[PDB]
Structures are given as structure tokens and as C-alpha cells.
Amino acid sequence: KEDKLYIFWGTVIGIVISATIFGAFRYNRNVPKTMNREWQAASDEYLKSKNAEPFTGYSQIQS
Amino acid sequence: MNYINRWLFSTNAKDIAVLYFIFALFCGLLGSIMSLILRLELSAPGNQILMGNHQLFNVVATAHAVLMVFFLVMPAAIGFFGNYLLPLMIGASDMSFARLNNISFWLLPPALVSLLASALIENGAGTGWTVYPPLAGVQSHSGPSVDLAIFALHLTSISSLLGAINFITTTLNMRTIGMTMSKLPLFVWAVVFTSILLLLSLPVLSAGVTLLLLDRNFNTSFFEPAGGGDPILYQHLFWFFGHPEVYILIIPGFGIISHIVSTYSKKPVFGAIGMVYAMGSIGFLGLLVWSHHMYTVGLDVDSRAYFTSATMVIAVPTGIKIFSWLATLYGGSIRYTTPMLYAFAFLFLFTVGGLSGVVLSNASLDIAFHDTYYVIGHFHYVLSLGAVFSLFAGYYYWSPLITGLYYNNNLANIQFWLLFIGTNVTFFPMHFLGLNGMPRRIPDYPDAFAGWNAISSFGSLISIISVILFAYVIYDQLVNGLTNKQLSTNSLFKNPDFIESNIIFNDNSIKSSSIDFLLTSPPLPHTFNTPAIQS
Amino acid sequence: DVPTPWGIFFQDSATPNMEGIIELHNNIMFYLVLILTFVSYILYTIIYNYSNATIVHKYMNHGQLIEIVWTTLPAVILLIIAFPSFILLYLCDEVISPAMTIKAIGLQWYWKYEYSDFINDDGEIVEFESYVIPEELLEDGQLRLLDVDASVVVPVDTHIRFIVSSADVIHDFCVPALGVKVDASPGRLNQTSALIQREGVYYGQCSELCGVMHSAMPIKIEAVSLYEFINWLDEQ
Amino acid sequence: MRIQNRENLQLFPFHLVTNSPWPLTTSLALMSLALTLGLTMHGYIGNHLWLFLAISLVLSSIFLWVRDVVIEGTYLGDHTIAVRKGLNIGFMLFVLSEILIFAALFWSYFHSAMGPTIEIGCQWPPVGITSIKPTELPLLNTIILLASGATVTWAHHSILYKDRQGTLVGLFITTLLIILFVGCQVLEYTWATFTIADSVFGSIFYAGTGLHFIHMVMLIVMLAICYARMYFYHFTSNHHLGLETTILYLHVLDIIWLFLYIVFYWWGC
Amino acid sequence: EETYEEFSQRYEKEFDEAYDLFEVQRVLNNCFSYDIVPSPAVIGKALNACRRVNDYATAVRVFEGLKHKVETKEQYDAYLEELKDVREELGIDLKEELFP
Amino acid sequence: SRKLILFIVFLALLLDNMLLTVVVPIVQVGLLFASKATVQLITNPFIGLLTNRIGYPIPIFAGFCIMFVSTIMFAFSSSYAFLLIARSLQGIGSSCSSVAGMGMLASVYTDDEERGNVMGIALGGLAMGVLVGKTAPFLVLAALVLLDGAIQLFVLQPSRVQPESQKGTPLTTLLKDPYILIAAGSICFANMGIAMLEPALPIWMQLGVAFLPASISYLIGTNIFGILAHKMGRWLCALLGMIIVGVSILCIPFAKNIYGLIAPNFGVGFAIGMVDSSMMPIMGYLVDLRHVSVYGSVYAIADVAFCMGYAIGPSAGGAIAKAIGFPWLMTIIGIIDILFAPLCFFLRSPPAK
Amino acid sequence: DVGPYSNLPFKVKNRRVPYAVPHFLFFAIGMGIPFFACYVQLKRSGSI
Amino acid sequence: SLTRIQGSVKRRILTDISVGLTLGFGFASYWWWGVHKPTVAHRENYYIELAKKKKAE
């Protein structure tokens, strides 16, 4: 009974470290000019005038 | 001088397997760091780590393909488990051609040097793993990089051919007194059936690579369409090697799983003759299909219909093996030790990665999936989760017998769960990126493919931590490993039964179906003086 | 059409061939889901019932009826899968009268389009080259690494035959919505056929590796009406 | 096993090789050959006397293996009935692998002969390339090979009837009946009208009949070491495995030449 | 291919010829490894076989395996109301009466 | 299109020799072994007249269905009379399939140079059945290929009865010609020796390794000499083939061991392959030169000459082996095969009409 | 001398430098070479 | 009576195959009648509205 707790709390502290490493490579990114909300709202008007994705959905907004 | 005549000038077959293991560990570390370099660039849109260089992205992908198709999986599955276990299972002292075993080892460190020197003298060799003719000419790659990379696929070919002839010649006339070739264990049959494909596939690859070399440097024009040749010929002469190759990587895994399923579930394997016939059928039907990698090149309409028919037939023998493994695990008692965890995680993920192969077999459906990340997600569920899992299970099964030193159970379980979680996070959104339409071999992508690329960059950092924990497991095995056999009862090879008392069990401890687990555990240098007897 | 950010499934169709592809994939997924659920239920039963058990049935090792049932039952599934696959392979192609031909030659890192008809007596064939718009010169709202300076403009409800070749290395023409994926190898011509049912814009990317600028080579197809196509062809 | 003094001799009929250094040296020679051939073909070295040292060291490494193969069989005396069967199975599985290299080269011929491209105006042997007439020197080579296949049967049937002069003469005649093949085929490569670079036709004709040239230098060497080892009394009337491997290697090359003469030299249209 | 009335004769013959504790536990181990449960006559022979070799724990562990082989609880109590004069003559106590 | 017909004919010949030869793993024995060949010999000329009436594709799939139901009746048959009936229906199905398939390859491929190559590929199925585990993968591969054939022939385009536009010459008019008979005799006397060698080989002397080199050499011989027979002349290939069959047949009595039979067996099989792929296209050439072009009855005659050896072989071979013995039987068949070879020169240029 | 530390090419116990340094340097080189290759080919092509 | 038990595992096998297939067919008949057919219906009703607008014009 005192070994399954050890395996569980060994896997949790293996997932927490990788999240903190990946977060450090996430603040320091090269963000291009197209990834902004005021640029992905201008693309929706062009995709609305020339009718695109009629059945499902079109939305280029992901902030 | 005794160091030289025993670890450099060697004859013993079991002492080359440990050198194969030490080489395979290094060549599986290098490619994994190269894969971490790729996955840290394919994270968010833009040009992040490699500043603007689209060379040194294709070079990294090529060198990550070669170092783990040719330098990790084959040396582990042929050198460490084939050279060591096959003489002990069939009951022979050593191999039939021992000096050929020594040359088959020592051809590989000169093959590593040329591949590492194919990425420093020039721009590099960014041709992909499949070195296609009209890109790898003297108009895009003009330098000593492709030439030194196709000389690393000759030495490995010579080593594999010389090992396969040794494996076939040994099992024919070097058996014990009472073994016919119908009482052999299943691992010996796996090694035999991969050694026949190694004979029947490698001359075509050697011919195609040599003709590519003659086209590059002696202006011969086999595959140049300004003199009367076709590039498509090379594709034929590549893929006739290519599809036997990907069964060579997976057939030695299967037999290993059988032993674990036969051991920790205390039942014999359901239908062994059906299993060896199924492996024979899989080995034979891997040579009559090669053109399903080429459906978009412009073939006939009556030739696609043959290769859709001959590809879906291979599902029938593999299902026999899967359902026989289920029938073996059905009735018996199951104790969950660290080989059986990897065994249970292989019967589910090989099925998931293999059911995607039926979707790609159709020529009508391959128009939507060719050169797309669906293919990558298909073959990573089978290569990383089918072969590497079998390798880890084989290591955790046979390492106390070979080495004599035990390991901590808890850290091995933490390693297994970290591999499981990180690898299932990494390769599953590749199916979604493939279905939406992301092509292969691109550093930069449109902004719509961003979000899933943020998630598949997170599991790789989980898997590298599992590799580092595996390194610490090996270190804890080597130091203080004599005192790691009373912590847990995983060290016992088989458990006491219901009626079998403990006092009776300590007198008669090992019950087996092979010669392997009754030896003294360091295996002796000369392990059979008098011959073994089978009725 | 355009890719969507958190995509799970296919893009939307504008050609009968892509609808046949979608229908065949959704037919295969039925049997694959059935097989995966059967295997997963058997492992669940094995884990829940026969874990750390006192009784071992160590003599149930032969089987004779049950080995026929896992040999004939997958075969019937393969025949049922193989019927519509062959019908889709043979049936949906250019059986009757293509109405146009556009030659799409692939150079090193751009595309070259020739509309081979509409020939004058002197050889005044309409021709253009399509490049990629760089990130620095984009206007407000254009898609990065997919938007071009010249686009292939075709009518609706007209069979169009694409003949694809190359001049340098092996390329691959792709428009995902239209169901077109054919190679471009430097010494032979290849053909595909497309019929477009609704107006819009259709985007695509090259597939087979060609060198450093593999990620910047888009394909853009506009599907105008017939009057707009005639007015466009009298300007170029 | 119940013979009286049985402990003093080995209890299983298999050969335990002593420790030898030659696998490492072969690999170190192939390292030098691979890197020098990769480098001299693109600059970076200039002098062409390192490649020749690499080839010479490789060939001396194989010769130094075969010495220790001979001494362990005619002097130490460790070749039982089982080890001979293993060596025969081994050699058969290299002859089979050396056949399948020619299969790929034959399939590289029929993929262009049947269905030629548009750049060559659709025609075998194409316009401007005069082929080699098969009623000249390619007849002489065929009849010399068929005679050499007949003379070694008089050499293997004279070592079984214990006639020494009659094994030496036949091997001598065969050794001079393979040198003439090489001498004729080096004269057919200096009196030709088309090179390795003149078509896909001149590129596959000098790549299927050039591997055969390298494979027939090996018979001259293997027959020299079979004449010289018979002159010095190493061959008995029932234990000779050097002759049996050279006979199986010659006949496969004769059958391969009879398929390099109907497909390459006669069939052109 | 083997029927109930041949199983329940062959295992009686095997139980009436064991000479050591290894053999009694060997025949007892592969008797509980079929689809047929042992008959009340076979188990009555197994306790005399355990009496000849003089072991006590094996005579208790036979009755514990019946609780796992038998499907329900009513059949287990139907086994224990017929193997009662065997128990109270030799002296075997069940596990749930010892509380070990 | 045109290649799927080649696939269908290859599978038809494969199933022909698989259901003929492979009966033991999957006097009464002389009559039971030859029950298939004689009923095929009788019902071969009827299908040649039937294909002119009802057309090519229907008898092929009728023969496949008849073969399937006859094999499944043979699967659980115990009495002798029902077993004889079952093998008779197996033979009559296998007689429809091969004749109609070879006629339809003759009909579609009109060019003379392509016909030899395609029939050289198609005749290679006569040795894969001799070579041929679980075999359920291969049966469903065959079922998938015939599903493709049925989809293209009967589903996408409608098919009526549709009798042929021209009326062919009758069977007796073909039998009055000397060239067709003397072409058929080459195949008959070439296959007679390899037909008689099989039952007498357990008498003289494991089993599969003796027959394996002929199956290895046959495919290589037919696939090479289908293409190259156009430039060399087919009569010369027939002459050299009969010569090599005779020499390799006389090579067998001097052999005194099982391992000494490997080298002549190659010299059998390759040679008989060069007999077949040379001479079976040229029959379809002769009707295009002298008669009206209907290819049914001529390939019926060719299948008659092929199956005469397997019909007459074991029953006469056992009697000769009991009477005189193996080496004189091999000597007389070898001298017959060598002596026939001079007169195949007559097919160099037949007179046109 | 057959025993549990006899079949390995490296010495583990009774050693001057402790085994942690040769165990760590092996993995350090193995995960440090393909960054050196990228550094060299980045610096040869202008970019930092 | 209650002291005669002959077959127990075979009934378990026949139940565990006849539930793993009903569950499989249940989890596959939601993919074809709740995910697939309404998408084809939506696709068709989009196309029986684009033609009527062009007919009006």
C-alpha cells in the first residue's frame, strides 16, 4: 500500500517538471505579426465575402 | 594484454552482445536529442531556434531516421538478444562463425563516424531518409555529404548479411541431441524468419544505392531523364528493401512478448504451430507488396487494385497472433510485474497503430493522406510504441539473468508510466493535423496548425525525463544491486502455487520451458561441456 | 478551403471525388471501431476477473472451432470493404468530355501556369507565374504562407483537366478540398480531373520535398462564374 | 560416451576458435577505404596513393584470414563432419546473395528495354550507338567458359581415383582458360564505340558485364590457391573443400554469362 | 474427451499411490486445474492421502480451494454437509474456525 | 482494362494445377488420380464451340463457381461414387476456365509481339500451384481479384449474350491442317516425360526438394523466353527446347543419388518452359494467317494436347515400370523427344491464305 | 573469477575515481554531440 | 444435485464474446447514425438552397 503512493507521487513530480521546462520555452517566443486578434478579424471578412467553409465553420480567431 | 584478447579480439558470442547494448544506448541517445531539437522548433509559428536555416532541419530529420532505424533497433534486437539468447535456447556453446560475429560488430563504429561526418563537411545531407535521385544529385547537394551517408548504408548492410548467414547456419546443425526443428522456441523462429528477409532484401538496396553513386559522380544517367532514364526505377529499387525492413524491426519483438505472456501468466502459448505459420505468412507477404508507398506517382488503374488487395491480406495472420495472445492471457493467473506492464501496453497500442494501416492501404483514400502527418502518426504508434516497448520489456526480463544484479521496481514503474503518458500525448494530435491537411517535412507552417503543435511539444519533454530516469535505474542496478532482491518479490521468476508450500518451493524454485533460467546467473564462459538431453 | 485552428476532421468538399473519399473512410471506421472495442473489452475482462487467481487452467491450449472463427470473420470484412473501394477507384473519373486543360509546371520554388487553349495564330498563349507573398509585404488580413500574387481562376460546373510536370525535381500538386494529389516528376506528364460545384477559394500546399524553400509554395484556386471568367480572360 | 579415456578429448564436434585480431583490422581498412573514396572524388586529398593502399590492405586482410582458415584445417585438424556441412551451407548462402545483385541489374535492363522514354527516340540501341556484334569475340569467351567447365570435371575425377598428374594439369589448363577471358574482355573494352556515359544503354552494359569481370578475377586467385595447395600435398582423396567451393562458383558464373549473352548482346530489338 | 466418471477414477487411482508430500501436492495441484470440479469421493481420498504422509496444513488448504472452484455458496455448503464424518474423525479444522 | 484479364487467367491456371496436383496433403489409385484429366480431355472441345455462341466472360465465372461447389462437395465426401462425381465436376469446371481465359487473352491482345509476352506471364501459374501453409490468405486474395473482375465485367457496363460477329472454322477443319497438330504434338511429347516421371520416382527412390528446382526454373524460363522468342524465331526455340528436354531426361539414369537429380531437373523445367511460351502463341498466329479469327477451338486443341500427357501418364507408366523398369523408360522417352526435334523446323514460314 | 561483476567491460567497485563520473560523462557526451553539430553548422552559415 | 459441476468456463467464454460484440456494435452504430448521416443531410440541404437562389436570379 505504501508503494503505489510512491509511484503516483513519482509520476506527478515527473509531469510538473516538464510543464515548468515547457513554460520557459513559451514566454520567450518569436511571435509573428499575423498572430493578433485585429489581424485575424480582417481575415474573416475576406473569408466571408468569398464564401468559405459553408457547411462546418470558418474562424481564424485564436488570439 | 588480457583486456585486448577478451574484449577486442573476441570469439565468445555472449561477450559481443554487451558491446552491442553499449553501442545501441549511445546511438539511441543521439537520435532522441535530435528529435528534441526538431520538436522544439515545431512548437509555435515563426523561426524560433534555428534562426532562418531550413537546412540543419532536414539534416536533423535524416540523421534522426538513420540513427534509429539502423543503429538502435537492429543492434539491440539482433546483437544483444539474438547473439546472447539463441545459443542458450538451442543449446549450443558458441556460434558457427565467431570471427564473422566480431566483424559484424566492428563494422558499425566506422559507420557512425561517416554519418557524423556527413553533417559537418558541408551544408549537409538533407535528402530525407529515402535518398531520392533528382534532389540528391550534383545540382542541390554538391559535396562530400550524400556520398559519405550512402557509405554508411553499405557497412551496415554487410554486417546484417554476415549476421543473418551466421544465424541461419547455426540453427540448422548446432542443436542438441533431442531437438528436431519443430520443438524450437518461438524466438529462434523469429530470428530465422528475419534472417531470411535480410538475405532476400539487401542486394536490391545495395544495387540501387551504388547506381545512385554512379549517377552522382561518374555521370552515368541511370535515373536522369535527359539521357533515357526514370527516377521512378529507384523508388522500385528502394521500396523492395523498404517493406521487408519494417518487418525485420518487428518480428523479433513478437516472440519476446510471447515468452513474457507464457511466463508471468502461468500458461503455455495457445497454438504455437499456428504462430510459427503466421510469422511465415507475414514474412512471405511482405515481399509481394512494395508499391503502396507509391500511389501518386502515376501508376495504372489495374495495378492499384492489385496492391490494395495484397495489402489488406496481411491483417489476417496478425489477428491470429493477437487473439492467441488473448487466449493465452485468458485462463491463467496474472501478476503485474514490470515486464508484463510493457507486455499489456503492447497488445493495445500495436492494434491502434495497425488499424490505421488499413485506412492507408486503399488507393482512393491515399489521395487524402499521402505526404501528410497521418502517416507519421501511423508509424510512430508502431515503431516507438511497438518495438521500443518490446526492447524495454526484454531488458527488464533478461537483465537479472545476464548481469546478476537486480533493480528497483518502483523507479521502473515510474519510468513506464512517464513513457506511456508522454508518448500518447506526443503522437495522437498528429492524426488531427493530418486530417486537416498539414504536409510532411516542413519547418514553418500556417498559423492554423499552431495549437496541436503546442501539445505534441509537451510530451517529448516528458519522455526525455523518462530516459534520464532509465539511466538512474541502470546506475541503481549496477551499484548496490545485490541488496535489491529482498525489497520486492518481483525478483522471483515464478510465484508459489496454491497447494505448493513455501518450504517445498525453496527447495524447487525454478520451473521453466527453456534452458535460459536454469543456468547460473552469471552465465559461464563455456556453458555446455557435456551435451544437453531432450527426450 | 482554409484550414481551421483546432481541427479534428476533414476540410469541406467541392468535388464528388472528395465526397466519395469521405464516405469510404466513414464506412471503414465502423469496422475498425468494432474491432477495437472487442479487443478492449477482452482485456478489461482479463484484468477484472483473472488477476491474482488461485486456479490456473493450464490445459486449455488447443482450440479447433475458435481458430476458424478468427480466420473467416476478418475475411468477410475485407470483402465488404473491398467492394466500394473498387467502385470508387474505377467509376469516378473523366469518362466523358473534359472541357478545359491547364498545365501546371513546377519550377524550383514557384509555380508556372499555362492555359493551353485560347491560342492566337501567332502563339499568344496566356501564361503566368505564381509566387508567395512575403511576410513583410502582406496587406491587412491575408493568410501567411498560403496567399499568392496570381491565382488560378476557373469556372464552376466545368470539367477541368490538370496536366502536371516539372522542370527541376519531384514536386506534388495538392488542393485538399478538390481531392487532387498527383506527382510532378521531371520527364513525364500526369493528369487529374476536377469538377467544382460552388464558388469560393481553395488553398493548397506542395508535398514532396524539394530543398530549402519547401514550405513557401502555395496553390490558390478561385472558382468564378462563366461571365467573370470571360471578362478575366479578355484582360490577361 | 562410455569409451575408456574419453575425458581427455572434446565432447562435442564443433570448433572453438582461438582469439584472432583480423576482424578489427578489416574494419579499420574499410574505414580508410570509405573515407578516402568519399574524399578524393571531391578534392580534399589530391594524391591518389592512399586509395591504393586502402584496397591493398583490404585484400591482404582477407588473405590473412584465409591463412588461419587453412592452418586450422590441415595442421591442427579441427574439421569434423558437422563443421564441413556448416561451411558448405555458409558458402551456398553467399552464392545465393551474389545472384540477387544480378537480378536487380537485369530488372534495371528490362525496365528501359521494354518502354523507352521520349528523349531517346523510342528505339533500342539508340541512334548513334553501334552495338557489339555477337558473332565476334563474345563467341570465343563463351566457348572458353564451356571448355573450362569441362576441364575441372577431369580434375575432380582424378583426385578421387588417386592420380596426381591429372589434377595438376587440369587446374593449370583451367587457370590459363580464365586469364584468356579477361584478356579478351579487356580488348573488347578498348575497341568499342560507346562508353559508360553515352546513354542509359552504355551505362547498364558496362555495369552488368563489369561486375562479372571482378567476379572472375576471384576465380583466378581461387584456382591459384588450389593449384599451389595441391602441389604441396594438402589434399586427400576424401577431405578437400577448397576444390568443391571453386567448382560451385565457376558453374554459377557460366550460367550467369549465358544470360548476359542472350539479353545483353543478342536481344536488341 | 475425458468424461466425469473416468476423471473421478483416474484421480482416485493417482491419489491412492502417492508416497511423499511432493507427490500429494502434485496430484492435488493438477486436480484443481480442469473444468470439472473434483467429486466428493476424490476429496475423501485426498484427505486419507494427506493423513498417510502426516501433514496438517494441506488438509486445511483443500477445503479453501473448494470455496474458489465452486460457483455459488449453496453448493459449497452442500459439499460440507457430506464431507463431515471425514472431518470429525481425522480432526481437520477449517480456516474460518481457526482464524489464523 | 486489359491487365485484369491477365490476372484472371493467371489465377485460373494456378487453381487448375492446385486442384489437380495438390490432393494428397489438402488399381483404384490409378483410376482416381486420372479421373480429372480424362473428363477434362472429353469436355474441352465443347467449350470451344460454346464461347463462340454465348461469349467469353460467362464460362469463366461459371467454371469458378462449379470448381468451388465441387471442392466443397469433395471436402465432406466419404463414398466412392460421390467422390468420383465430385472430382468429375471439379474437372469440368477447370476445363471451362482455362480454355475461355486463354481464348480471351488471345482475343484482346491483337498485336503479335505483346501476345507472346503476356502468355509467357500467364503460363507461369502452372508451377505456383505445384509449389503451393494455411492458404486462407491466398484464397481471399484470389476472391478479391475476382471481385474486381466481376465488378468491371458485369456491373459497370451491361453485358448481353452477344454472339461474335464472325463465324469460326469448325473443329474438323482445324484438325485437317497439319501445322496446328504438329504444333500441339510438341507440347504433348514435351509434357509426357515429366508426367510419367512423377509416379515412378517413389519406386526408384525429401519429396518436395526433388520437385522444387523445376518449379524454380519454369517461371524464369517462361518469363524470359516469352519476350525473346520474337527475334529468335519460335521454331528454333521449340527445337532447342525439345533437344534439352531429351538430354536432361537421359541425364537421370546415370544419376545414383537423390541430390544428383537437382541439376537435371532445372534442365527439365526451363527447357519445357521454352517449349511452352514459344509454341502456344504461334497457334494463335496460324489462324490469323490461314483461317478466320476465332480463338476458342484452337486453344481447346492446345489444352487437349496439354492434358493428354497427364491423362495417359501414370497408368501406362506404372505398367512400363513393372514390365521393364525406370532407366529404359527414360531412355525411350528421351530418344523420342530428341527424334521429334528435327521436324519442328517446318514452322519457319507457313503458306498464307 | 566468474561472478556478478566479471562479464562487464568496465570496473564498478574498488575504484579510485568513483563510478558516478564515468556514468555521467557517457550520457553527457551522448546528449551533447548533436548540439555541437548544430552550433558548427549554424556558425558556418552566417546566423549567430 | 449440487455436488455435480461439469462446465463453468465455457459459459463464461460464450457470454464474454456475446457481450463484447453487442457493445462493439452499439459503439459503432452511433458513428453511422449520429455523426455521419446528419452531416450528409446538412450538405444536401445546403445544395438544395444554392440552386434555388440562382433559379430566382
Ligand code: HEA
Ligand atoms: C513499423 C513497421 C510497420 C508495420 C507493422 C506496418 C504495418 C502496416 N503497414 Fe506500413 N508503414 C511503415 C512500416 C510498417 N507498416 C512505415 C515506416 C510507414 C511510413 C512510410 C514512410 O514514410 O517511409 C508505413 C506506411 C504505410 C502505409 C502508408 C504509405 C503512404 O504514406 O502512403 C501503408 C498503406 O498501405 C502501409 C501499409 C501497412 C499495413 C496494411 C500494415 C498492417 O500490417 C497493419 C496490421 C495491423 C492490424 C490490421 C492489426 C490486426 C488486428 C486485428 C484484430 C485484425 C482485424 C482485421 C481487420 C482489420 C480486417 N504502411
Ligand code: HEA
Ligand atoms: C526508429 C523509429 C522512430 C523513433 C524511435 C522515433 C522517435 C521519435 N520520433 Fe519519429 N521519426 C521516425 C521514426 C521514429 N521516430 C522516422 C523514420 C523519421 C524520419 C521521417 C522522415 O525522414 O521523413 C522520424 C522523424 C520524426 C520527426 C520529424 C518529422 C519530419 O521532419 O517530417 C518527428 C517530429 O515530430 C518525430 C517524432 C518523434 C519523437 C518525438 C520521438 C521520440 O520518441 C524520441 C524519444 C525516444 C525515446 C522515447 C526512446 C529512447 C530509446 C532508448 C533510449 C531505449 C534504448 C533501448 C534499450 C535500452 C534496449 N519523428
Ligand code: CUA
Ligand atoms: Cu516545390 Cu515542392
Ligand SMILES: [Cu+2]
Ligand atoms: Cu509499406
